[PDB]
Symmetry: D3
Subunit: 234 residues, 6 copies
């Protein structure tokens, strides 16, 4: 059994949603899945597997940050995951984005050290699996939920990024910051699995707190519905 996600190959489905927060993982399992069963809780990395419209789907907590997420993704692939979609939150890099809005990550600027270590410092363009990406975009459109399609930035130091630095990045196409996408995308290609990422804007860089829980939760629900429908398309 893997060191951190202490499960067994038969526990994980080929399709997996990857929320960073264990509380959201549980909410997803109980709100959307049939016969959900928790296969892991070691290190608080709550992982669940159930059925969504007749198809097996797992929901695995990644923790915060690319180091934590890389560990989970690497072990997930070992356990049999083949399609992995991150469902997280992000901080808007501009007033253009409003809390609750969705972002289908077209690519992720690698401002983290996990992708850097794997790459031995070489340049790279972290992108999701093209099929998964397309399906996430399609579903978001179909459902009609307010969304954007473009770049996010995966960072390591959450409290280091200033509003001024955020504005600067937005000028280069960055819509928001988050802390996991880049490594997921990289590992997708390295391990030969399909990955994708959709995010719900929970606030704007510089803000001392997150948007109203009402706002946030509706955004999360939309995001998860899009991802669940998308993973069944691939």
């Amino acid at each position: 059994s893997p060191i951190h996600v202490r499960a067994h190959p038969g526990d994980v489905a080929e399709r997996v949603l990857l929320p960073g927060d264990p509380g959201r993982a549980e909410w997803i399992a109980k709100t959307f899945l049939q016969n959900p069963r928790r296969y892991n809780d070691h290190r608080g990395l709550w992982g669940y597997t159930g059925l969504y419209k007749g198809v097996p789907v797992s929901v695995q907590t990644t923790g915060m940050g690319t180091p934590s997420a890389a560990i989970v993704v690497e072990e997930l692939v070992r356990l049999g995951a083949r399609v992995l979609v991150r469902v997280g939150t992000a901080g808007a890099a501009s007033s253009d984005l409003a809390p609750g809005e969705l972002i289908v990550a077209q690519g992720a600027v690698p401002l983290d050290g996990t992708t850097r270590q794997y790459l031995e410092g070489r340049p790279y363009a972290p992108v999701p699996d093209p099929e998964v990406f397309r399906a996430l975009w399609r579903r978001a459109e179909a459902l009609g939920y307010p969304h954007r399609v473009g770049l996010v930035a995966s960072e390591d130091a959450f409290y280091a990024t200033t509003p001024e630095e955020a504005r600067a990045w937005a000028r280069y196409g960055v819509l928001a910051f988050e802390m996991e996408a880049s490594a997921l995308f990289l590992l997708g290609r390295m391990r030969g699995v399909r990955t994708g990422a959709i995010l719900a804007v929970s606030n704007r860089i510089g803000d001392p707190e997150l948007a109203p829980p009402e706002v946030l939760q509706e955004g999360v629900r939309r995001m998860v519905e899009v991802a669940l429908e998308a993973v069944l398309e691939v």
Copy 2:
């Protein structure tokens, strides 16, 4: 008038194809465009403008490498370009890719110094405009032309890359090597225009020569046709 592409307002259409080879530009204008006109020849950067199915389309030579391509794009934008699609060739980094095959660039690993200079050395994920990327993908399908969707690597030292290095990169998702995409994608976001890139494998890294004129020409013909259809879609 710009320094390198010496044209004036009205010469360049909103939609532009960007072949690196001036020979190809001429062949594209004379083969697909009605009443093509050459607005520039300065520094061999041949630029033509004509009609494709009633819509104005320009074909501008970029030259080889991102420094050259960057100059041409910066000036094209100043002249009125708003949708720029690179139509070029690339070297397969793997063995699964066959010469003549098409590649819709989902992103470009920035291995060039041009993007690095604009970014001041910071990490980045060069990606095309999502709608353009999508339109190219869709069109490739509608025409039924065999294609691949994914990463290419934009490099500076054509003769430095070794088959061994190419193979290593392929294990990271790089489908092939070319020398222009990264800077085009970056500028697209920096200047607020829509960019894209479609390539035609013309060889495998390590080969002393390109592929047979015909096998390669059919690829180039299909690539240009997909790009024309796609630019009219946005």
Copy 3:
């Protein structure tokens, strides 16, 4: 209230132990603390506050990786933490360090991106607060528990480091690898608080699994006792 550690200053003591695993945090509170109470469980970052020999001591989960630990440490300082000591595990960089052995971290090689982001890429020498370092060392002696004193390396890509690479680093003084120390030390100096780290070897890097429970548990129990005694010293 902080974004991730949703608590109030009055809930957190000045002396805090920082385990990476929420399971160990819970085990520490129940095993060593008097009247322990869980003040946070948001995101699975279990945090408890109780009493050790009459002195208030908090045990806060950091999660894995410097990005996660940095978030927790930043919010703790905001909550009133003044003395923070990491109590975790590490993989031995050479065949001579046996599982269960304790390591008082004299320093932490910054192989992570979190410190890199905060430092804007500049060189640095992550070190604990001298007095805390000294107390940890002294207590280990007072308790008569076999221990090593030296450098550890804080990494981001757990699964990228090969046993050969680990050993190469051992030649430079690295006793073992972990994923949090560097950021804790840096923030200690940046925020003006006292920090330290003590580790229990859980495996010799390269092992498919961790050491047998009893061997590792005794070491973990010893590490914790040294830490608790040490924070009361400052």
Copy 4:
């Protein structure tokens, strides 16, 4: 036959001038050579070969940027080029440099990604062949043409360099900015050939337009004269 510069050993002399602009390559081949024969026009890399004072001299277009230049230089060496002297223009980084003034490049600051790729990110000091350098310098003095001897900087992002940055570099000895010398010098040492570079200032960084064609044209004339004389002496 070279991929880009389609020619064969026999078409190229041992002594070669290297203008970036194909238009200048033609002017030179016609204005100073006797019986000039164009051996290549592929990709607009107009290449000629004739006789200067009874000696065979090739004039080969490199294109703009070290990526393009590196490809042309690498192939010329394969065709048998032994002495390659670049004859280009540059943008003054100083205010004491007037358009038309010549510059015998003593070295080239490598701000380009091409040299960086060949060097694998290692530091270097791009310099011409010592003999060629002295020849150009000596000829310039003999012909009494106003000139400077010093450093230039080879850049990638033409439109990224600001007057402010250019002034800063000037204080470190940089006389002007160009886009090809560094790679040429590096390849000269790598491939064991003699290289050199002389430049005619066409403007000052910040200027939207170049200097009067009249003043500028004379500079090119003098420059070419110096270069031609020099290549024969080695």
Copy 5:
């Protein structure tokens, strides 16, 4: 016999003090040691061996800069040196440090190229031998001499560092700047010898001259006494 420090094994004691100034070396030998004997003067790298409380002790000049100190350290280790303690001067990074104040280096920010070359650019945390570091701290306390315990930064360009930069580093824990510690600490681990460093503040970054010779001399005296007592402890 080594290239620079031309002594033979038998001239050098296991315990050694390392002043950068040969003038201080001579002064230390004649002031504190019994029967001082000079074993080397080649290249002005004056080295002496005598007795301190019946224990053999050497005083070896390192010269200024890590390149020079690295050469001397390398050769001393080759000659059998086992405990090496630097006794130098440093420039206060903040106005919090008064001239003549002693600093027990807990670590040293590697802003030098010597450590960079040895580490091939990799990150690192240069730290003293833990036992030596502790002995220095202990002795400072016993002798009753005021002192600070913390980080210093080892730089290469004495005249490049500005007051603003100095105050920026002070925010990250840097107490003062010096020019040899980082390399000593690194070689300490690489060559398996025990190292340490104690410094006397001789000025503030930005000061045209050093502090009062009388105040400085007293600081140097105390420093040397501490080092001597310390090396006898290991």
Copy 6:
């Protein structure tokens, strides 16, 4: 009076030879100068001033490494030095270089941290003053001493370079390795003074000892003579 080279403006002449070894500075002063006088011995940086063919000439010790040499050069400039020529030794990087062979440095690969700091990490091509370089070359020819003209590499870690790396650098034009040139050349441009460097091969990278005393000694004499003649020319 400067901090390290404690001299008065009237002590140093406009023309200065910069040996790294103090013993060589003295030999030079006594062997070639009329009425030589030592104006400084502080920190072992022995400096002399005398007359060479009726022209004042100073001989200043720089110590080993760019950090030490930078301090000396910075101070010599502040004292009025106008022409500074380094006269040192170097380690041959290839096999075609015999011991005692002279090298007139055309440029210096900056593998050092001193130049790196002054340049804030930016690329650069350290080169001597054109006229000085020219003079040294011409004089070596005049005196008819066998010489080489080309690149040397200035390094920080004398004992880090291996024969393998040395051979690798030779393929890039690096004739030999030394430890001062790069910083001298950079400061030359920065401070507005004329600098140069001529070297005598004392060994081959990897040799345990230097070349035979007389083989090298003859080279050093020829070297000093070339430098003296050259400085009087500028």
